[PDB]
Structure formats: structure tokens, C-alpha cells
Amino acid sequence: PKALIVYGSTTGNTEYTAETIARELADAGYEVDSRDAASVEAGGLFEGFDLVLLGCSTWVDDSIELQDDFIPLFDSLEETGAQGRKVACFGCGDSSYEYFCGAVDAIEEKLKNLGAEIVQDGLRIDGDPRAARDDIVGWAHDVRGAI
Numbered sequence: 001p002k003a004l005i006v007y008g009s010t011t012g013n014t015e016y017t018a019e020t021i022a023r024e025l026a027d028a029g030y031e032v033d034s035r036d037a038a039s040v041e042a043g044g045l046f047e048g049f050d051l052v053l054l055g056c057s058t059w060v061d062d063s064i065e066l067q068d069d070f071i072p073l074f075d076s077l078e079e080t081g082a083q084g085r086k087v088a089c090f091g092c093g094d095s096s097y098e099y100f101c102g103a104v105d106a107i108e109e110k111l112k113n114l115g116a117e118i119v120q121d122g123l124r125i126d127g128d129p130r131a132a133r134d135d136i137v138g139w140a141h142d143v144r145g146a147i
């Protein structure tokens with residue numbers, strides 16, 4: 001199976017998380033393409049992929065709390081080929097904030113409105129993901145199991 005991982009990361013946490021999930025899928029036999037949201041184009045981005053994993057960090061804001069590189073993709077999610085696509089989301093944040101990993105909720109709800117199939121509840125990491133390595137790996141393992 002071919003998996004697409006797209007992440008938006010400012011300080012590297014969600015990017016480390018994306019790389020960790022990418023290895024777990026690769027060791028399990030998937031063909032994985034991992035991309036920074038700052039370099040992709042929304043149009044047909046999901047075409048040909050069996051599984052798509054989207055991730056991003058949350059930044060307190062009055063209009064949109066998604067990490068900046070991910071906003072253009074998020075605003076054009078309806079052109080990516082999300083209907084009937086198997087997808088799962090993940091993101092890093094901090095539980096000291098009211099909207100803890102609120103970007104994950106935002107992305108899940110819009111993929112659900114576009115007809116995607118959410119295969120697992122989202123991975124929400126509090127603090128340094130290097131300390132949650134077990135949780136990332138375990139989540140990646142359960143996502144493969146739902147495909």
C-alpha cells in the first residue's frame with residue numbers, strides 16, 4: 001500500500017512526529033511519501049494513495065489556529081481527492097492552552113465534511129514528541145490495522 005504523510009511544523013515537533021510514523025509504516029511494508037505542507041500543491045494531491053496522514057501544530061489565534069504552512073492546503077482540501085479516502089490526523093500542541101491540539105479537530109471535521117473516511121481518532125501530542133515515541137509508534141500500528 002502507498003501512504004502520503006503531509007505535515008506543517010514550525011519548531012520541528014510535528015515534523016519529527018511525521019518522520020516517526022513514516023518509519024513505522026515503512027518497516028511494516030508500505031511505500032511512504034512524506035512531504036512538508038510548504039511544498040505541496042492541493043490539486044489532486046491525494047490521487048493514487050491508499051492512506052493519507054495529515055498533521056499540524058496549533059497556534060493560538062483569533063481567526064485560524066493552524067500552523068501557517070498548512071493553511072493553504074487546509075483552505076483547498078476540497079480539491080485534494082479526499083472523498084472516500086482513508087485518512088488519519090496527528091499534531092503536537094500543549095495542554096496549557098485551551099484549544100489543546102485544536103488543529104487536529106479542525107482538520108478531522110473538514111475531512112469528514114468532504115466525505116473522507118477517518119480510520120482512527122487523531123494522535124494529539126502534549127509537549128516533546130521525542131518523549132511520546134511509544135504513543136506515536138503504537139498509533140501508527142493501530143492505523144495500519146484499520147486499513
Ligand SMILES: Cc1cc2nc3c(=O)[nH]c(=O)nc-3n(C[C@H](O)[C@H](O)[C@H](O)COP(=O)(O)O)c2cc1C
Pocket residue numbers: 008009010011012013014015056057058059060061065067092093094095097098099100101102127
Ligand atoms: C505562541 C504559541 C502559541 C501556541 N498555541 C497553542 C495552542 O493554541 N494549542 C496547543 O495545543 N498548543 C499551542 N502551542 C504549543 C505548540 O503547538 C507546540 O509547541 C508544538 O509542539 C509545536 O509544534 P511544531 O514544532 O511541529 O510547529 C503554542 C506554542 C506557542 C509558542
